[PDB]
Design a protein around this ligand. Structure first.
Ligand SMILES: [Cl-]
Ligand SMILES: [Zn+2]
Ligand SMILES: [Zn+2]
Ligand SMILES: [Zn+2]
Ligand SMILES: [Zn+2]
Ligand SMILES: [Zn+2]
Lengths: 50, 396, 396, 396, 397, 133
């Protein structure tokens, strides 16, 4: 139970993000109901991961 | 292929095991595997192709995990599981159909559809689990360079062929010495016919030989050998080799003599059976040589003595026949047989969606043309599509 | 049905797995399932009924649970398990036998014996677990109106019928034109005979047509087609249709001309094969139409020209054959086949206990009569008894 | 035997389930079983193969356990497992081959090879676990003397025999009354021939009887019964009983009359079918009594009336036939059949390593000679070697 | 196999590099590899050779590690290393010979000798290192079922065959039309002979065709095609197909006409060359079809016209040749070739110890028998013994 | 050319030497060369083909460096390395095929394919090592 719900519990935390994408191109800020404008990435598609 | 098989096996197990009232311990490992499958598939887009009339289909995975905390599965649990299972079954069936209708000449064993190539990525290797079916087990063993074999009840190893050879003939076709044969599927019916009944033969014996070169090696083959060929034991009007005229065949059946059945591998005799009928075992061979003799009966009762005069005209033609039925065998390669539906499934899917002819298989997946020219590229493509067809058969 | 199957599957698993010395971790889930079965059955009284000569039997369940506190199973554990297993196997055999010998026109799919109706109660659904057998899988699918599928090696789809039709006849029965056929099991042998050898037929062609209507739709069928029919290629004395007189048949086999095998679904041509014999695939059909022509050969050697004069008397009758063998097929309905034992088991149980004929099945469970008139009620009762027979054959 | 089977089954599971990326929960129980096997086999020396050309192989087991700590299996885990599995599979294959080539007149059921004798010790019983194969299940049931059951498709119960009996005959062989038959494998083709066409028989009926005594009792048998014996329906020149002369047989086939097929057990009628063709069920029998009749047609057309004169010479010989095929059956004893490969495996192994003829089996494992004289010692040795061959085919 | 190859590779590197006076920095990695080999092999018993006349040899390993404190190698260091190397080389030679003289019908690619079986265990996998030889590289690619490639100078792809076909003949054998060919090794010499010189042919053209089916597919093949066949250009007395009598062949060579080389794969045209002689490239094929015409020359000088009369007797028979030489090719299976010694080494070892005929290979390793019936089991066993032969050749040779 | 040869030779050395069970000291210099190649190639886009029937192929390098072990490489290490090696080998084969099918009357010794022209840039000279064939 804990292992299957770990990701959901961790992603619910307000004090850690799961990563950061450095894209030296100018990306529009997303419009999210929880923030207004936010530089939030839904996933990591299209970037090499370190 | 291992991943596609794992998906199908997971879905088949979920259908068979996620049932109302069952203890969770009966399904716990399966639920873990199912949730692993969901986790690995979530967030991925798939496209099953538009080849032929098979429609383009897009697949998305945003499914939740199945519960783990009940003592016994209930109706709600079964309904929730069934919703996800149906979508996964549809996706797997479409991937199997997309892979079954494609072929390649350079690398026919490698996946051909985009979905199966995507599923071969390392990110999906987590789905892989118990590979227990004969076809997937053979697939893994062959990827490991390991000796593996498919077991066939009545293997369709012989291309269909009904032909004759005339060793003695004339334009009027009335003193003919030769052989008639049907090789069909797992069955060989051969018959040597002499019109003069070996009246003027050395020692009054006429020798017949029939060689069948199998396109693949067979092992541990159970074979029935019967001393007559009912296919060539009744009067017939037969075309000539060019079809210019038609000749007459009027058999009278005698016991074949000096019957010697050799099963050979690389031109060497592996098994030899002399005057043995019933069950014989050909342990490992690529060729079957049947020698038999029409022996003129030294003594004849008047009714028999009439049928075989000293000279022409010959009205009753002395024929000696053998019948060889491969009941069971083992092959390194894949083959059609009387029990398995892989060929029928592949052909049906190719027919339903108007799949054009490719550079590998003959049109219509016709088995005679396929087995006649069983090239390595054809073998690779055919094992691939047969494994995919079995994987589809687990669910469809 | 799923509960009866679950009892049988648990008992088979216990027989196979609960062995001396085995790791308890090998059996933990099986032990939990077995103890759940014991708890559910404990305190319940069953009566397996006295239909026919089947003896009335009373079943009482007060059994202890199997232990859970070993590392490896020992002899004590195996013996304790085996006594209970023996009692349960006896009970399941008697329940299955009680159900197999029963039928009804109204709800033949529903349980008929009292014990199986009792086992359908919700207080037994906890016993239910992995439904992996083909018969139980199809049973669950059909309970949900889902696409079912049974795989048959040599399905017994054709009721036995050795008949002939004469399209040209007269009291002398010496200038006859027509067809004779044996449709038996998975084999159709048909043969069109012309006594005049189409001397006066338009274009010297005689067309023969043989339509066989399958009582259920077959899918993904692998079929062997052979040019000749060895069953109608030897001389016979055949009764007349009224049985008043016997006529004579003296075939000489010509190869059939323009052979056309059509596989049709609702009268629409699904598959068409022209002049192809080796091995074909009919993907979905319920009708087989065989068209084949006797073509008088334009050029003949003197013997052949002697066989076929311009006019009567005709002593050598030109026959063109055809053989059609369904090796493997898929049907949405249960069927007898050459490999399974459901029909034989049901018939054996009904015979051994002198079960009177009922409203649904013909006497002796005769397969020809059954499959000729395969009504929906007959299908329901047959699927029920065949699923019960498979459940029984898991243990007996 | 149970230990050898458990080793083989554990290895097959390990080959199929220990795959890269798989959840450890899919393999946990298998890993426990595998580690138990390693612990038990560690420190033990085995020797296999000193009979015929089977080479002497020495086996030493010093292997590490497989890990338990991973969440998904990775390449390292799979490689370590694969090395151990390869060694164990080689050992099991060699032990099976060593057992398959040995026989004993006294205790042929008991192990013969030294390795299987060592594995029968208590210190190996821990390896034992799920015994789910039909052959090992039958082995265990036979050990406890519970009713065993082997299901066969086309059982090879009839030793090959093509003979004839003449009830009326003369040196010229022109007025002959009698029977000729082929009893081969799973088929009985029997034909009664009267040259006078029962002109002088009482009531114009000639009675033919044929009794086949099966060497083992068959239960739940599915039988195809067809009216005609196509094997004895064409002109034939047959050696005389002493072989001093040949006689002529020009059959003309009439349908058999008053066909009565009885299936007998201990000389009592268990099943009986009167003029029934197609599929029939014989629930329990050791003898088949086929009684049929040539009934001279009371009414004939001129052709038919010409075939059968009032007195000699008789040029057309009235023959009635019967074909009986056992599609599927159940036997309490091991038998060869068309779908399995046990006999072929044992014969192939005995031929590849040049195993000298023993005191139990005929040379070459000739099935006709084996089933003709199927003695209890032969049965015990054959069940042993067939169980070993089924265990071997799980891996090899 | 990889372990045996790594042992041999380490020993060869040690023989080549552990030399007097060399900088220790030249051998540090090799010293580590050698010491890992010694550590892995120490305490292990091996037995090689119980087949034919190959003696039973027992091998025990209790060696010290080579030192690592020197900055340059001195004579004593090299001598102790050489002692260890000599023992190891003897052992590897014996293991290779033991593996080469064995064959299996079932898993011919797998090890057959007990020593190599033992070397297949996990504990020995530590020895494994650089697998750079062509044969071991192909071995590793074939284990993973990746596309293999063997480069052969003059591949021995044709079994020996010297025969003739007669299309027109009669018992006197004086008006013969047909073909004779020697297919041997990497060479096809073919010649079409018409005794009448196509006097009564349809337009004075006699078409000849020769089909050679290779038992393995060749890729990237450089092939020389020369118009004449010197092998069938001199007077011959040839047996008849039944051997009853003998016929005479008095050829006169004419240049072949409309020469067409076809290289085909699975009965499909891959390369076609028309009237091209010299070097040509067949990129991927398993069959060669050579079609060529004898064209009666319309104009003849008096000697030429006297050679070919209008009717019999024909004394000078018009023959057109072709010579085909595969110089180099690539095959996905092992093959004998002119430059390597794998077949010769395997045969030499098998003959030196009187290895009995086995169930896989011909009665003595005859290449004609092998290549004629080059079955997959034979291919697996041959690739195994050839890889072992190359490993042995790294040290013994 | 020297750079393309160096890429190919690095890949061949990686295939031959990065084998299960081998001492890390056997491959240390090779691993350093390979990781330097990864660093130099990562982030660069290449295009091959577009001549005759040679297909257009796009190559992107976003690979991680090969790790280090204490004593010996294991199976995990080999599979991880082989993924990168396989992609690079595909790329090098495609670049070679693109160069082999092109020709120029002027400057026929110079590179003709776009990928090799890019590989002649200064940034890729780091890849260059033993030119021994
Ligand atoms: Cl069958
Ligand atoms: Zn002819
Ligand atoms: Zn009538
Ligand atoms: Zn069958
Ligand atoms: Zn007699
Ligand atoms: Zn000649």
């Amino acid at each position: 139970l804990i292992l299957m719900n770990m990701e959901q519990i961790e992603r619910a935390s307000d004090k850690i993000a799961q990563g950061v994408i450095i894209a030296y191109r100018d990306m529009q800020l997303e419009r999210d109901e929880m923030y207004g404008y936010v530089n939030i990435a839904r996933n990591l598609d299209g970037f090499q991961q370190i | 292929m291992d991943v596609l098989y794992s998906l199908s096996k997971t879905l088949k197990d979920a259908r068979d095991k996620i049932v109302e009232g069952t203890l969770y311990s009966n399904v716990s490992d399966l639920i873990q595997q199912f949730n692993q499958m969901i986790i690995t598939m979530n967030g991925n887009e798939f496209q099953t192709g538009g080849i032929g009339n098979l429609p383009i289909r897009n697949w998305n995975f945003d499914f939740g995990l199945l519960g783990t905390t009940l003592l016994n599965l209930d109706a709600n649990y079964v309904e929730t599981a069934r919703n996800t299972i149906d979508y996964f079954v549809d996706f797997v069936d479409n991937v199997c159909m997309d892979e079954m209708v494609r072929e390649s000449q350079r690398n026919g064993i490698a996946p051909q559809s985009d979905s199966l190539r995507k599923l071969s990525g390392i990110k999906f290797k987590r789905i892989n689990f118990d590979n227990s079916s004969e076809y997937i087990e053979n697939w893994n063993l062959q990827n490991r360079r390991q000796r593996t074999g498919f077991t066939f009840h009545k293997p369709n190893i012989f291309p269909y062929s009904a032909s004759f050879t005339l060793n003695r003939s004339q334009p009027a076709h009335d003193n003919l010495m030769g052989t008639m044969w049907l090789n069909a599927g797992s069955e060989i019916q051969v018959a040597g016919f002499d019109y003069s009944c070996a009246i003027n033969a050395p020692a009054n014996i006429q020798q017949f030989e029939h060689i069948v070169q199998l396109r693949r090696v067979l092992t541990t083959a159970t074979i029935t050998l019967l001393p007559d060929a009912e296919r060539f034991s009744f009067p017939r009007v037969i075309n000539s080799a060019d079809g210019a005229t038609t000749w007459y065949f009027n058999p009278v059946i005698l016991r074949p003599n000096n019957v010697e059945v050799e099963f050979l591998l690389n031109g060497q005799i592996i098994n030899t059976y002399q005057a043995r009928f019933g069950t014989i075992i050909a342990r490992n061979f690529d060729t079957i040589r049947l020698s038999f003799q029409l022996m003129r009966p030294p003594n004849m009762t008047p009714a028999v003595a009439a049928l075989f005069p000293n000279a022409q005209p010959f009205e009753h033609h002395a024929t000696v026949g053998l019948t060889l039925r491969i009941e069971s065998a083992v092959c390194e390669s894949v083959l059609a047989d009387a029990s398995k539906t892989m060929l029928a499934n592949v052909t049906s899917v190719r027919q339903e969606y108007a799949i054009p002819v490719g550079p590998v298989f003959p049109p219509g997946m016709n088995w005679t043309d396929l087995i006649t020219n069983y090239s390595p590229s054809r073998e690779d493509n055919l094992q691939r599509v047969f494994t995919v067809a079995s994987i589809r058969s687990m669910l469809v």
